[PDB]
Amino acid sequence: KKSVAMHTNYLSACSFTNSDMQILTASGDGTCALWDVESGQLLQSFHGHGADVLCLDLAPSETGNTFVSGGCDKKAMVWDMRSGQCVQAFETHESDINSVRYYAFASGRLYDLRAD
Amino acid sequence: ALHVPKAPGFAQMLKEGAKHFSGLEEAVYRNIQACKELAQTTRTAYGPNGMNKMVINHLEKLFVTNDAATILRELEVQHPAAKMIVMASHMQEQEVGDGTNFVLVFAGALLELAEELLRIGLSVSEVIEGYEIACRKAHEILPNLVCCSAKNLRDIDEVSSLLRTSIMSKQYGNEVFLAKLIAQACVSIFPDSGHFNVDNIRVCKILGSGISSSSVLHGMVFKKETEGDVTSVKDAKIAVYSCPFDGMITETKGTVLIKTAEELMNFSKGEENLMDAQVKAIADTGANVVVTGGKVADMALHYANKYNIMLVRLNSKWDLRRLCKTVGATALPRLTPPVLEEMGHCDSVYLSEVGDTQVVVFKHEKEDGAISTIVLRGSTDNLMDDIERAVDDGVNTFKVLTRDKRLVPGGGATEIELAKQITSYGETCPGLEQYAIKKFAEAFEAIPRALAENSGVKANEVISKLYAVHQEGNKNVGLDIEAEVPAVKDMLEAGILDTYLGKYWAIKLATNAAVTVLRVDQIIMAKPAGGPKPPSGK
Amino acid sequence: MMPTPVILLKEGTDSSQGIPQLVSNISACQVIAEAVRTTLGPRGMDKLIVDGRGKATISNDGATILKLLDVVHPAAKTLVDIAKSQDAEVGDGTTSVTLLAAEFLKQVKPYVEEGLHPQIIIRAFRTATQLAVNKIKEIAVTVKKADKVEQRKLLEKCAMTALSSKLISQQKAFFAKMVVDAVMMLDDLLQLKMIGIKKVQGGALEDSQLVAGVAFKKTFSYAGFEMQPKKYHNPKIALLNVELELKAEKDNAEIRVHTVEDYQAIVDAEWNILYDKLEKIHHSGAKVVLSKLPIGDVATQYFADRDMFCAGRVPEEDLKRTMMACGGSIQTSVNALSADVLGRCQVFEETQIGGERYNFFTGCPKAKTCTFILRGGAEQFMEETERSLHDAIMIVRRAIKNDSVVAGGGAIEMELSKYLRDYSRTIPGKQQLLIGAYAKALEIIPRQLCDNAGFDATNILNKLRARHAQGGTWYGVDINNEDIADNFEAFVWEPAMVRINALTAASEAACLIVSVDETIKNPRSTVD
Ligand SMILES: Nc1ncnc2c1ncn2[C@@H]1O[C@H](COP(=O)(O)OP(=O)(O)O)[C@@H](O)[C@H]1O
Ligand SMILES: Nc1ncnc2c1ncn2[C@@H]1O[C@H](COP(=O)(O)OP(=O)(O)O)[C@@H](O)[C@H]1O
Ligand SMILES: [Mg+2]
Ligand SMILES: [Mg+2]
């Protein structure tokens, strides 16, 4: 097992990426983190989203480059590995999104990426 | 010296929640009291002048009815002797269909008089043997009391007259209309073959127009809507399928394996072409109506709409089988076009709206067919349910008449004559069993007494007049409920008659239940468990 | 009683028997009637009911008010049931049924209290109801001329009478004209689903319109939609049930290739499949494309490039109404898009109605459907306007089925009461009191009209009785002039079947309630 345990705060969700090479983690401070299983280095930490993240979803058709994160900011915001930026965000949710399902993705309100 | 300890032996060995009742006073009298109380609860609904009862079960479901079996079913009866009595009533309902209240009243009277006999000094075994002897004598007498017979069943007027009495106890105000309806429905059924099936009579309940607007339909009525665009067919050629209206798939696992671009571009087009070919092959046989038991695919629906085919989807397989019986078709297992023998024909299939509900009607025109449907109107769901129970009683009476055609006078005439002759027989029998025989005879008085009490007259005067008239030699004289004072009249002219089988089975079952209750001497009840129903009942 | 160490029924079983329980049942029916009593007449008032979730319902409809009331009394549920029955079979008079049934029960409560046998009361009710129904059928005014103008006038008057008790009574003539026009364009079954009811917030009642065609809200446009033209002058409409998307060919489909050439061929094949569907739709000649299944952004841009209009995820009923208006056919496959299966409307346009975008299909000459667009200041306002229009539509449909009318305002019931009293004065006498009680109970509706209007009910009832006795059939309450008038000449018309069903249902409910002598309530299971 990886059992890395490099984390100052607790882990709301530790979602293993679809690519069998790296893991995606989000701490209790609302910042997501990407770790390489082989090397162990933290590739990049995602700022913003001040309240703690609560769900992590990678892209379903492999494509280990984009993911969506939601937490207590009542936000549904999408990232990108190749730039480390919030490429897309949503505002419909208003209460501490618990779990998110990737279809577009349904979170608890079905969002569509092609039309925002 | 301030406490009474439990006696050594069985009293101490009993479990914490168990109960033990032993001996006459502790067991037999308590059982008789419970059965008498149950009979008292169900008594007031007896006869045409019986009063409806609103019974609410544990699921807050209303039941307004004067049917004894339904009332007992919806009652949470807990006393086990009353449980035997209820089981006897339900067995009577299953075997015949009418006479449950008679079973209750007779069992209660028998147990009351058995308690009296036990008090005066007789033993339980002597009472039991006297009751059995009197039951045998009553069964011997009963055939001699038959007044008339059905003598025909394909007619409408006299069948309605026969069925009037059965559905006169319930819906006393308007029984001629219901008698005509049920007679028509039953005469449509019951072909040249002597076998009559109760399930071939269907009841459809549509709300809104009052029960006077109810009708009988030679066909089947479904509260559904057409899947396609066609909503009316005049010369239906229904083809029934038990499979979903879609291209069948492999039962193991389906995986469309694509290896070239041409296969990818042609797969969906070929599947659609196959669907179109199958639908057109079905239509080419002339089948303008298709009934399926599964889901309907979008492409199949489109191609059916293209060829003007009426689609009906029936979820229940019982409904599918009943429709196959009604129209005369065979439920094909695959989506192949039907051969000429497997294609059913109905003279009219169309979509209609009765009141509010949308219905699909498979309507014949001949005064025949395998299945007939009675559409029931009304202003309340409970009222329509009560009318449905009355229709069920009438259909069961017709089935009994098909089984045995003999009839006996009603309104207590048969009961009074039986009581008189059983008393006459018991007056000649020596020994201690004469008391039990006489009490068994007297127990028959509870039927005319209940009828008089419900009608609102003095029961004793009616019973005395009935004895006087029967002593004069009139065996067909019973209570006249169309009077404000105690009066009697001949019931053969009035047409108030009861089936011989109903009386026979009711007497037999009531006597059996009474003697079975009397046989119990000790009761050992376990602690009432809190389990969520036995696993047998799911 | 006695403890009876082992008991018969389960503990907690509550039973009530005898005269007191019947009196309590009558009182419960009176309580139910009181809750809808003030909603009857042109001077009737609305009731507001709030559920547990906090949503408020405002309605003048008796059936709706009774349904929102959560009645648990076994005898009182019968009044709600007969109100639902009247709503289902007729659609109007759901207050009259409850008032009549409760008044019957109240009138016979005294006779119950001296111990009269309930069967006698039931028989008297049955006889009185049969006589009243026969009298209604006999004296109902019908016109056997088949005049289209006269039929339209009769339908409009019936709709106005059915509408002159709601909040839209100020625009009752205008709404009745809409309702008659909408109903007359249904083909043969007068299906309710073929009349669209769209509620758009904002605007006055006079801003509400009836569309001789079909209209529906814009449905989640994709990117590139705003480049599509929003008005056509002779469009051909393609009604489809097709998902125009780049997606997997099938759920169980799986592609296995071992060469990059085959990879590119597969990608181009998917693109070519989508473009073939789009090209077939385009070459069909259609300009407006509607689909029940989603239409993707690629298809939206493709149609925008061709100056075409697309709208996916259209509701099924809206597609059916578009079929019945334009005259096409919904196609699950685009392989055969002939001119037969293409809809046609004179003008298609997208406009803004109160901060919402709506698509319009007007100019249809052979339309078999309609679309009501209702305007109001609140959602409950539009909901109650829809309820009133539903009442009017049901009344107009029933009038189309049979144009047998009787004067309103209680005139018909005063005539029935006079006839029933005249009949009761010529019978032995035990039934005479009950039939007279039935006739007196028939007077509740005009008295309730007077009470709601602030009248003096006694004087108006006396004048009505005298006028009916001395000659005159259609004399009822004149709400505006504080007096009575010939309501037939005042065009206060109702279909005869409305009163027939009301009397039948009320009598059946009263007989069922009276016939019950014992009520048994089993202990609740799984209280949780
Ligand atoms: N018109 C009538 N006049 C007098 N007695 C009648 C009449 N119709 C039916 N009965 C009597 O009512 C009894 C039927 O009671 P019912 O309520 O049907 O109980 P069950 O369903 O247990 O037979 C029959 O025994 C019959 O003698
Ligand atoms: N213009 C009018 N003048 C007098 N009475 C009217 C008028 N319009 C309707 N009514 C009366 O209102 C009664 C029905 O009230 P309403 O609330 O419209 O329907 P519902 O019976 O469904 O509540 C009818 O009995 C009718 O006689
Ligand atoms: Mg019976
Ligand atoms: Mg009205």
Tab-separated table of N, CA and C in Angstrom, chain C residues 479-524:
chain	number	residue	atom	x	y	z
C	479	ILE	N	-78.109	38.133	-7.446
C	479	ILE	CA	-77.090	38.560	-6.491
C	479	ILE	C	-76.886	40.069	-6.548
C	480	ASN	N	-76.944	40.651	-7.746
C	480	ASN	CA	-76.615	42.065	-7.888
C	480	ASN	C	-77.713	42.964	-7.330
C	481	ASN	N	-78.976	42.604	-7.546
C	481	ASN	CA	-80.096	43.485	-7.238
C	481	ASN	C	-80.772	43.167	-5.911
C	482	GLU	N	-80.175	42.304	-5.086
C	482	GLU	CA	-80.691	42.000	-3.749
C	482	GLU	C	-82.104	41.428	-3.798
C	483	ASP	N	-82.444	40.739	-4.881
C	483	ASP	CA	-83.814	40.294	-5.100
C	483	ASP	C	-83.771	38.983	-5.878
C	484	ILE	N	-84.906	38.599	-6.452
C	484	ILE	CA	-85.006	37.406	-7.276
C	484	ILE	C	-85.313	37.825	-8.706
C	485	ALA	N	-85.005	36.932	-9.643
C	485	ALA	CA	-85.241	37.204	-11.052
C	485	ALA	C	-85.312	35.886	-11.805
C	486	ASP	N	-85.869	35.949	-13.010
C	486	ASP	CA	-85.926	34.790	-13.896
C	486	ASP	C	-84.519	34.517	-14.406
C	487	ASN	N	-83.858	33.519	-13.817
C	487	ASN	CA	-82.453	33.275	-14.121
C	487	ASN	C	-82.239	32.737	-15.528
C	488	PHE	N	-83.252	32.117	-16.134
C	488	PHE	CA	-83.117	31.707	-17.526
C	488	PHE	C	-82.998	32.917	-18.443
C	489	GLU	N	-83.793	33.957	-18.187
C	489	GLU	CA	-83.665	35.193	-18.946
C	489	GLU	C	-82.393	35.950	-18.593
C	490	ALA	N	-81.789	35.654	-17.446
C	490	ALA	CA	-80.533	36.260	-17.036
C	490	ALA	C	-79.322	35.476	-17.520
C	491	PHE	N	-79.539	34.421	-18.307
C	491	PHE	CA	-78.468	33.611	-18.885
C	491	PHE	C	-77.595	32.965	-17.814
C	492	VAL	N	-78.193	32.623	-16.675
C	492	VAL	CA	-77.510	31.845	-15.640
C	492	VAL	C	-77.858	30.386	-15.921
C	493	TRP	N	-77.064	29.752	-16.778
C	493	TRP	CA	-77.360	28.422	-17.288
C	493	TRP	C	-76.343	27.413	-16.779
C	494	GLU	N	-76.825	26.225	-16.431
C	494	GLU	CA	-75.983	25.094	-16.084
C	494	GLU	C	-76.442	23.873	-16.860
C	495	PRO	N	-75.523	22.981	-17.221
C	495	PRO	CA	-75.941	21.706	-17.809
C	495	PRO	C	-76.767	20.907	-16.813
C	496	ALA	N	-77.765	20.191	-17.335
C	496	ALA	CA	-78.639	19.410	-16.467
C	496	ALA	C	-77.871	18.299	-15.763
C	497	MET	N	-76.887	17.713	-16.449
C	497	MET	CA	-76.127	16.621	-15.859
C	497	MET	C	-75.361	17.054	-14.620
C	498	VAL	N	-75.026	18.340	-14.499
C	498	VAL	CA	-74.349	18.818	-13.296
C	498	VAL	C	-75.226	18.585	-12.073
C	499	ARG	N	-76.474	19.054	-12.132
C	499	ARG	CA	-77.392	18.854	-11.017
C	499	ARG	C	-77.778	17.392	-10.861
C	500	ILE	N	-77.905	16.659	-11.969
C	500	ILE	CA	-78.235	15.238	-11.878
C	500	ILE	C	-77.164	14.496	-11.086
C	501	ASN	N	-75.898	14.693	-11.458
C	501	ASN	CA	-74.802	14.034	-10.760
C	501	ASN	C	-74.697	14.522	-9.323
C	502	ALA	N	-74.903	15.822	-9.093
C	502	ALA	CA	-74.827	16.341	-7.732
C	502	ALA	C	-75.857	15.671	-6.835
C	503	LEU	N	-77.109	15.608	-7.293
C	503	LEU	CA	-78.157	14.977	-6.501
C	503	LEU	C	-77.875	13.496	-6.293
C	504	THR	N	-77.446	12.797	-7.348
C	504	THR	CA	-77.182	11.368	-7.226
C	504	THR	C	-76.076	11.097	-6.212
C	505	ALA	N	-74.962	11.824	-6.322
C	505	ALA	CA	-73.842	11.611	-5.415
C	505	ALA	C	-74.207	11.978	-3.983
C	506	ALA	N	-74.908	13.100	-3.789
C	506	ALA	CA	-75.291	13.496	-2.440
C	506	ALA	C	-76.220	12.469	-1.808
C	507	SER	N	-77.194	11.974	-2.574
C	507	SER	CA	-78.109	10.972	-2.043
C	507	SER	C	-77.382	9.678	-1.714
C	508	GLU	N	-76.471	9.244	-2.588
C	508	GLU	CA	-75.719	8.025	-2.313
C	508	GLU	C	-74.876	8.174	-1.056
C	509	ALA	N	-74.220	9.324	-0.893
C	509	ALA	CA	-73.418	9.554	0.303
C	509	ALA	C	-74.282	9.555	1.556
C	510	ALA	N	-75.442	10.217	1.500
C	510	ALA	CA	-76.322	10.252	2.663
C	510	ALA	C	-76.816	8.858	3.024
C	511	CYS	N	-77.211	8.070	2.021
C	511	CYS	CA	-77.673	6.713	2.289
C	511	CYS	C	-76.562	5.859	2.884
C	512	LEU	N	-75.345	5.975	2.346
C	512	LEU	CA	-74.229	5.201	2.878
C	512	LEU	C	-73.920	5.589	4.318
C	513	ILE	N	-73.942	6.889	4.621
C	513	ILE	CA	-73.659	7.336	5.982
C	513	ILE	C	-74.737	6.850	6.942
C	514	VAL	N	-76.004	6.955	6.538
C	514	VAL	CA	-77.097	6.543	7.413
C	514	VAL	C	-77.077	5.036	7.639
C	515	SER	N	-76.695	4.259	6.624
C	515	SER	CA	-76.744	2.804	6.727
C	515	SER	C	-75.740	2.232	7.720
C	516	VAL	N	-74.789	3.024	8.200
C	516	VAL	CA	-73.764	2.538	9.116
C	516	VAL	C	-74.252	2.700	10.547
C	517	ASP	N	-74.181	1.617	11.327
C	517	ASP	CA	-74.587	1.646	12.724
C	517	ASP	C	-73.442	1.453	13.705
C	518	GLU	N	-72.334	0.850	13.283
C	518	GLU	CA	-71.197	0.612	14.160
C	518	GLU	C	-69.906	0.979	13.444
C	519	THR	N	-68.999	1.620	14.174
C	519	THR	CA	-67.677	1.973	13.675
C	519	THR	C	-66.627	1.323	14.562
C	520	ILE	N	-65.708	0.584	13.949
C	520	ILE	CA	-64.656	-0.128	14.663
C	520	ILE	C	-63.312	0.343	14.130
C	521	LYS	N	-62.410	0.709	15.038
C	521	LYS	CA	-61.082	1.200	14.685
C	521	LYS	C	-60.044	0.291	15.327
C	522	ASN	N	-59.321	-0.458	14.502
C	522	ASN	CA	-58.277	-1.329	15.009
C	522	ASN	C	-57.084	-0.504	15.488
C	523	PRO	N	-56.350	-0.995	16.486
C	523	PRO	CA	-55.167	-0.267	16.954
C	523	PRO	C	-54.135	-0.129	15.847
C	524	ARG	N	-53.453	1.012	15.842
C	524	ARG	CA	-52.478	1.303	14.802
C	524	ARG	C	-51.283	0.366	14.914
